[PDB]
PDB file of C-alpha atoms in Angstrom:
ATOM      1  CA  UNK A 150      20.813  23.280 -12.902  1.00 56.56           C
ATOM      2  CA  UNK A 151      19.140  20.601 -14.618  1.00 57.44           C
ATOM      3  CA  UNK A 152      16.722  17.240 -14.275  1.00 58.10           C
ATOM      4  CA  UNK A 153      18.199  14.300 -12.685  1.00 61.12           C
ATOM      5  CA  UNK A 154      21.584  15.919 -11.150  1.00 62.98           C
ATOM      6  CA  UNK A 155      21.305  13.475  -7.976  1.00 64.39           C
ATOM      7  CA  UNK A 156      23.867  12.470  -5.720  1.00 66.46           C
ATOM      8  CA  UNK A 157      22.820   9.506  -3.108  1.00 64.64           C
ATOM      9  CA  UNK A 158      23.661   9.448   0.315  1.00 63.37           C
ATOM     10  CA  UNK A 159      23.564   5.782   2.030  1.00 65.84           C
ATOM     11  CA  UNK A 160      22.585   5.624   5.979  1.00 65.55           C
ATOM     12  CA  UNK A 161      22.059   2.012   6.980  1.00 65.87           C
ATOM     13  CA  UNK A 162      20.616   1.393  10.668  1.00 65.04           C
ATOM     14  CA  UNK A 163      22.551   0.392  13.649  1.00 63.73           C
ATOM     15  CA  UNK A 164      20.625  -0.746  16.719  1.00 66.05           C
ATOM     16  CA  UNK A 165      21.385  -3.334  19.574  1.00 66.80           C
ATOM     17  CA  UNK A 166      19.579  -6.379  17.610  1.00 68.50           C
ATOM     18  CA  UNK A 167      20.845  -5.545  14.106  1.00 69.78           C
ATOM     19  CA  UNK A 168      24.619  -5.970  15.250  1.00 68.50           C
ATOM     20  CA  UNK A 169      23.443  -9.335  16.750  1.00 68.17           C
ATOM     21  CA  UNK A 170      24.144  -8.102  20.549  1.00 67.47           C
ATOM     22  CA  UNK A 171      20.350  -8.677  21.907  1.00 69.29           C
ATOM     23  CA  UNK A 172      20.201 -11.158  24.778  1.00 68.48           C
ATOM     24  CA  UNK A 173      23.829 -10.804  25.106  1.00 69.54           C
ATOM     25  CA  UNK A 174      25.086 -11.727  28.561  1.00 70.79           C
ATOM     26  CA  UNK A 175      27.822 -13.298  31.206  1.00 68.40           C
ATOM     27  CA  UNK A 176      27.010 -15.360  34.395  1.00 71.88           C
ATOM     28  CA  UNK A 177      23.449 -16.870  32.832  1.00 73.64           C
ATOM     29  CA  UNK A 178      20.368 -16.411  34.779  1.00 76.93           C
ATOM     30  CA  UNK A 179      19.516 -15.362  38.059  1.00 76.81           C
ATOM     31  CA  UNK A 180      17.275 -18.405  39.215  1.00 74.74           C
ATOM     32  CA  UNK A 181      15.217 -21.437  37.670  1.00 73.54           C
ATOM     33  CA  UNK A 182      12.720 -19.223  34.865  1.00 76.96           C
ATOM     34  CA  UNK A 183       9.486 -19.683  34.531  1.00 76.55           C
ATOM     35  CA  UNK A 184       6.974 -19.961  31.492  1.00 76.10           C
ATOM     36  CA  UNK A 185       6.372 -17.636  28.732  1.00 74.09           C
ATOM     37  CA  UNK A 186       2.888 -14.791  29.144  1.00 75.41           C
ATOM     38  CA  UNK A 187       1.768 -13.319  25.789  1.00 74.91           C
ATOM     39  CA  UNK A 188       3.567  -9.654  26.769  1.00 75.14           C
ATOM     40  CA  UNK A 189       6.974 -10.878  26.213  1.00 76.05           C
ATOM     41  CA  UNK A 190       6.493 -11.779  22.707  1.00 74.86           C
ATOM     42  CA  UNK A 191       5.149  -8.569  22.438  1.00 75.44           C
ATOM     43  CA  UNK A 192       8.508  -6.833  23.835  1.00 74.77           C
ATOM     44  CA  UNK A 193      10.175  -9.429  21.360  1.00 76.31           C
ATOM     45  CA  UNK A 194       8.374  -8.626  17.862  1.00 77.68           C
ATOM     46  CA  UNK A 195       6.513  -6.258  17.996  1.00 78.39           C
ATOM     47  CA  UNK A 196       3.480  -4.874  19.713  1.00 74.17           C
ATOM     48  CA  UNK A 197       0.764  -6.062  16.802  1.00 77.12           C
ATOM     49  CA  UNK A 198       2.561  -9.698  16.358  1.00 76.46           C
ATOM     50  CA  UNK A 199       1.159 -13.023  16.070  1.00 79.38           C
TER      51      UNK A 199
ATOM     52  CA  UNK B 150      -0.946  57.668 -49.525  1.00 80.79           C
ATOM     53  CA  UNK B 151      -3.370  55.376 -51.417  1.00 78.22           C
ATOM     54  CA  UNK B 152      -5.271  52.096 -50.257  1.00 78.57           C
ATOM     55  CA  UNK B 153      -3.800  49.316 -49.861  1.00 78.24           C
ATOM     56  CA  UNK B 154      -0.862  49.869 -48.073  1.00 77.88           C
ATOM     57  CA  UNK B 155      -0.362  48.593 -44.802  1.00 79.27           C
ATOM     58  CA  UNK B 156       2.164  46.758 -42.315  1.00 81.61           C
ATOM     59  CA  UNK B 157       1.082  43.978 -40.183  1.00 77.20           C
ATOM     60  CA  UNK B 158       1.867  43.822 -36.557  1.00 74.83           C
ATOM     61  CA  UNK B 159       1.121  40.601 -34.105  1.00 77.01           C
ATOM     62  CA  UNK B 160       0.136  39.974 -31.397  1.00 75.63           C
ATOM     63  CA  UNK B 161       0.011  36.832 -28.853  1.00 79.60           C
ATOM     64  CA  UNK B 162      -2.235  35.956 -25.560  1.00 80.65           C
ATOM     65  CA  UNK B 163       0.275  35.757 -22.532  1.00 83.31           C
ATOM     66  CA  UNK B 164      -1.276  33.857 -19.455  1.00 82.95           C
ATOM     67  CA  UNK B 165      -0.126  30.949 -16.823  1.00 81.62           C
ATOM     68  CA  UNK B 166      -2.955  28.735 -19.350  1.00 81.58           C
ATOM     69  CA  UNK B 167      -1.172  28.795 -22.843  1.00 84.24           C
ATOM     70  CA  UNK B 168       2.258  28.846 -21.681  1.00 85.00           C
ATOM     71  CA  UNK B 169       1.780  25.719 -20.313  1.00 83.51           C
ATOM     72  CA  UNK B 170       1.960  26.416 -16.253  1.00 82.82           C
ATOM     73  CA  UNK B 171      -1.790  25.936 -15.233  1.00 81.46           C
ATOM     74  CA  UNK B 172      -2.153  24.097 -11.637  1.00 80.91           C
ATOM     75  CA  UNK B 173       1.638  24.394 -10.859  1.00 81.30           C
ATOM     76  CA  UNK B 174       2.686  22.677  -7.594  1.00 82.42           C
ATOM     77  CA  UNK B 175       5.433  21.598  -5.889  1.00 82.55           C
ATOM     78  CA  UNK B 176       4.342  20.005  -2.781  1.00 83.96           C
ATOM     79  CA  UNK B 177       1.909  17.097  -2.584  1.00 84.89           C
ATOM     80  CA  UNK B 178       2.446  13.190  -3.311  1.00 80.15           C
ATOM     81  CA  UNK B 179       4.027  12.276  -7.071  1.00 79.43           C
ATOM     82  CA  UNK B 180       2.217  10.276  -9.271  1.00 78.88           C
ATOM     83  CA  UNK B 181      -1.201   9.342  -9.228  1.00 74.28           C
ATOM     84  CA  UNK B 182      -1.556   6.893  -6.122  1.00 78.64           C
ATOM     85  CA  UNK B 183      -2.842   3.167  -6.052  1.00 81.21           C
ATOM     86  CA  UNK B 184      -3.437   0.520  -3.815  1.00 80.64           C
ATOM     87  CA  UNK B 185      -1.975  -0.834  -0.849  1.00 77.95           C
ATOM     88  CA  UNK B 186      -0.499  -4.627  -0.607  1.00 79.26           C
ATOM     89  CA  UNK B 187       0.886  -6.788   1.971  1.00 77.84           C
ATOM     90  CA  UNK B 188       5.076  -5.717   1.956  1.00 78.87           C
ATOM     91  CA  UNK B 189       3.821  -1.984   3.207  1.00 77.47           C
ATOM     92  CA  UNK B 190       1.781  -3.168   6.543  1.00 77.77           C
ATOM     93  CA  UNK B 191       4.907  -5.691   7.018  1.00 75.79           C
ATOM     94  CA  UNK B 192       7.704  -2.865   6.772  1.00 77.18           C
ATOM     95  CA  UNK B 193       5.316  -0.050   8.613  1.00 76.00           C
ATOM     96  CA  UNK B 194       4.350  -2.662  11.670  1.00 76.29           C
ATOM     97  CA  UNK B 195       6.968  -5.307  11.466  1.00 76.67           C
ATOM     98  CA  UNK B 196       7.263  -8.732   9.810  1.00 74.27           C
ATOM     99  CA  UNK B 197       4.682 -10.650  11.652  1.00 71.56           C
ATOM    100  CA  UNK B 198       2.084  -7.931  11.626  1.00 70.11           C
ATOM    101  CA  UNK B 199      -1.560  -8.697  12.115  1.00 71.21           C
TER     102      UNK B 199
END
């Protein structure tokens, strides 16, 4: 009934990349890859990255 | 029954100015707001943001 009577509540953030699991795979790829076009890196970090 | 004798009342202005209340509001940002840096754009967009 006063100022400054808080009690804080915690909630971290659990995704697939934050627990380390991106990329995460058995039997490696399914043929000889190929090079690299700018949309992956957008799919990687971000739509605005550099 | 003769002049000079008298009892004093008193008497006090009541409004939401001298109490202390004017331009009372709850919602709205806290604190008067300032400028925007670097650390913002990076958490709002990601760390490599352009």
């Amino acid at each position: 009934a006063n100022d400054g009577e808080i009690i804080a509540i915690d909630l971290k953030e659990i995704t697939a990349k934050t627990l380390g699991l991106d990329g995460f795979n058995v039997s490696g790829p399914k043929g000889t890859p190929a090079a690299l076009v700018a949309a992956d890196y957008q799919a990687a970090y971000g739509t605005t990255t550099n």
